[PDB]
């Protein structure tokens, strides 16, 4: 029934009827809308089928595009009520996902709520069409995964590795180093970059003051290295 | 002598002495500071050596880190004069470069000047240490290539391909399509992703209202696909 786990609803509550069904994975509840659901709530066998028809959204499976994301959304509380909230495009949460085909990332806008929503809780726009489902949060800030904003994906079956950086340290591939000399010595002695179906690329998120996304080959050679914003919230809880 | 090509200097001109040497490539002038220079001003034989010791800056070779970038810089006009300007972190130019080792990009902050500076013109901070050299410009806005702002690089010997998008088209790898069905059919029938030293990855910048960076394999399979901001100025002139 309820997608909000708290009994007393907070915020601006309006009478909006938004369908959802309730499910469970790994001891945590989640909701679906038809076949649409968060990727992190899917078993591997589910991902292997849902990945073949979905549109590419970070941490969401859906066979049809979601409706457009505007200035506000309604977040489902229960069968008959929803919370009306503004979208915040200034405060962004960094989402990651993998479905066995693509490893996606997104600098997602957020909404702030004192309610405790489960994964997969649907959000609708003014006309009642589903615009997104909830995925991850930090504190009271919930990401809104959609097709706007900075984001991307890597073509690989490997899941993300999520790591933390140290100030002043240097990073290449899977490794970190005290100095450029140590880093360059390592690079020089690696075999040449190679990628194939038995050697899929590994995506890495490095969190910290100067955060990075790295794509590294099975043999240790870098494929890509990117600097992302220190303002992104990368300490996130997948619901 | 002069790194500004106009005879009458505009702006706030101060007595600051900044060393530089004058050079020419393909009939266009450029300046160096010691061994430091813009990548786009180097011959292939020069790149092949300079690439082996340089630090990673988009479109700049330097064996030593540049000094920190703060709120303002002085841009060399001639042997004894420089223009005092503010750094603008709101208006960003998108830079690309390749040195045969890495294909880099950067969302660079800018400075505005009515003077016409050549490529490689040095910029210094309050203490006179070189902070960057000029690379590209759009209008009166010059990029400041440095270690700040979003950016990255791909490990490859290929140079960038720079393309313009068309309304209504979908993009995968090297190709564009009028419908999702045709795009998905194309992907399904490519050989599996493969990369090696005789099949290096190809970086592509797609410019337009919904711009992209795509890294594609020699055989046409994607390695990565990312969405970047339509506010980035991607129409730039390498000086």
Author numbering:
A (entry chain B), B (entry chain A): 3 to 241
Publication excerpt:
Poxviruses are large DNA viruses which replicate exclusively in the cytosol, and encode poxvirus immune nucleases (poxins) to degrade 2′3′-cGAMP and prevent STING activation. New poxin structures include the alphabaculovirus Autographa californica nucleopolyhedrovirus (AcNPV) poxin from Group 2, lepidopteran host poxins from the moth Trichoplusia ni and the monarch butterfly Danaus plexippus in Group 3, and the betabaculovirus Pieris rapae granulovirus (PrGV) poxin from Group 4. In spite of dramatic sequence divergence, poxin structures from each group reveal a shared core fold and head-to-tail dimeric architecture confirming poxins as a single enzyme family.
The structures of the cabbage looper moth Trichoplusia ni, and monarch butterfly Danaus plexippus poxin enzymes resemble self-cleaving proteases from positive-sense single-stranded RNA ((+)ssRNA) viruses, and bind their own C-termini within a vestigial protease active-site pocket. Close examination of the high-resolution 1.45 Å D. plexippus poxin structure allows complete analysis of the interactions between the C-terminal peptide and the surface of the protease-like domain. Authentic proteases recognize their substrates through similar sidechain-specific interactions within pockets adjacent to the active site, demonstrating that lepidopteran poxins retain a protease-like mechanism for recognition and positioning of the C-terminus within a vestigial protease active site (Hedstrom, 2002). Notably, the protease active-site pocket is entirely distinct from the poxin nuclease active site, which forms at the dimer interface between poxin monomers, explaining how 2′3′-cGAMP nuclease activity could evolve independently within an ancestral self-cleaving accessory protease.
